[PDB]
Ligand binder design. Structure first.
Ligand SMILES: CN1CCN(CCCN2c3ccccc3Sc3ccc(C(F)(F)F)cc32)CC1
Ligand SMILES: CN1CCN(CCCN2c3ccccc3Sc3ccc(C(F)(F)F)cc32)CC1
Ligand SMILES: CN1CCN(CCCN2c3ccccc3Sc3ccc(C(F)(F)F)cc32)CC1
Ligand SMILES: CN1CCN(CCCN2c3ccccc3Sc3ccc(C(F)(F)F)cc32)CC1
Ligand SMILES: [Ca+2]
Ligand SMILES: [Ca+2]
Ligand SMILES: [Ca+2]
Ligand SMILES: [Ca+2]
Lengths: 93, 93
């Protein structure tokens, strides 16, 4: 009966649902990242799903520049979205 | 529909379910933090937790030392739980 614990469970497991598909099992390459965003975050991705848009995502997220998104970098991304949601509650000051 | 967007929703909404009970409406005080842990993260806390341990947790989450957990501080905490979880999927080395 813990919604917040289930929500941490989904956030972590979803990462691995896609990261294990190709190459490094614990990181998202471009293709695995595209699947995750398109399937799991379509409200974020929204209308725009063109190739130069995923390029910028990869560039924003891949801060250590190994060409993949690891778990820490994915957490930073989810936490950026969480911050944007929080602004709604803070009344958009 | 989208478990990951629903998870983000729960992460962000649970903070505000407790933050707005007392004083600063956007921050958890020591008492609003205890209620959130106790009620929403019971596997993390365990049962019968002493004040030394709680105080440890508070000062750990409270990086700016103002005696409250703000949303940015709460995201660091969750992302640290998440990374502990991620170790299960990874080797644990
Ligand atoms: C089906 N229905 C479509 C729209 N969403 C809400 C979208 C906005 N949203 C949001 C905004 C303020 C506070 C909480 C939330 S939950 C949430 C989670 C992820 C995303 C995202 F997408 F950015 F990652 C957007 C949102 C609710 C579900
Ligand atoms: C097509 N796609 C549709 C959705 N928008 C997202 C609106 C911007 N916003 C945002 C900004 C930067 C990084 C992440 C997010 S997700 C998000 C979630 C909630 C809200 C909130 F709560 F403020 F509404 C706003 C945003 C991006 C473009
Ligand atoms: C009822 N039952 C209690 C036990 N949990 C699993 C506890 C550990 N858990 C975890 C471990 C590895 C991978 C994913 C997860 S989900 C998760 C979420 C939060 C916590 C926490 F608590 F630390 F925040 C612990 C866990 C499943 C449900
Ligand atoms: C009562 N309570 C039971 C839980 N333990 C937490 C120790 C485990 N751990 C952890 C460590 C530091 C910070 C947060 C977390 S939550 C967490 C989630 C999953 C796992 C995973 F995946 F490894 F199991 C281990 C942990 C604290 C005492
Ligand atoms: Ca991979
Ligand atoms: Ca990287
Ligand atoms: Ca408060
Ligand atoms: Ca603080």
């Amino acid at each position: 009966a813990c919604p917040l614990e289930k929500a941490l469970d989904v956030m972590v497991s979803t990462f691995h649902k896609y990261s294990g598909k190709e190459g490094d099992k614990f990181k998202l390459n471009k293709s695995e990242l595209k699947e995750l965003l398109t399937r799991e975050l379509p409200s974020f991705l929204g209308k725009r799903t063109d190739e130069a848009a995923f390029q910028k995502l990869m560039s924003n997220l891949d801060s250590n520049r190994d060409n993949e998104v690891d778990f820490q970098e994915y957490c930073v991304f989810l936490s950026c979205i969480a911050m944007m949601c929080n602004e709604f509650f803070e009344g958009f000051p």
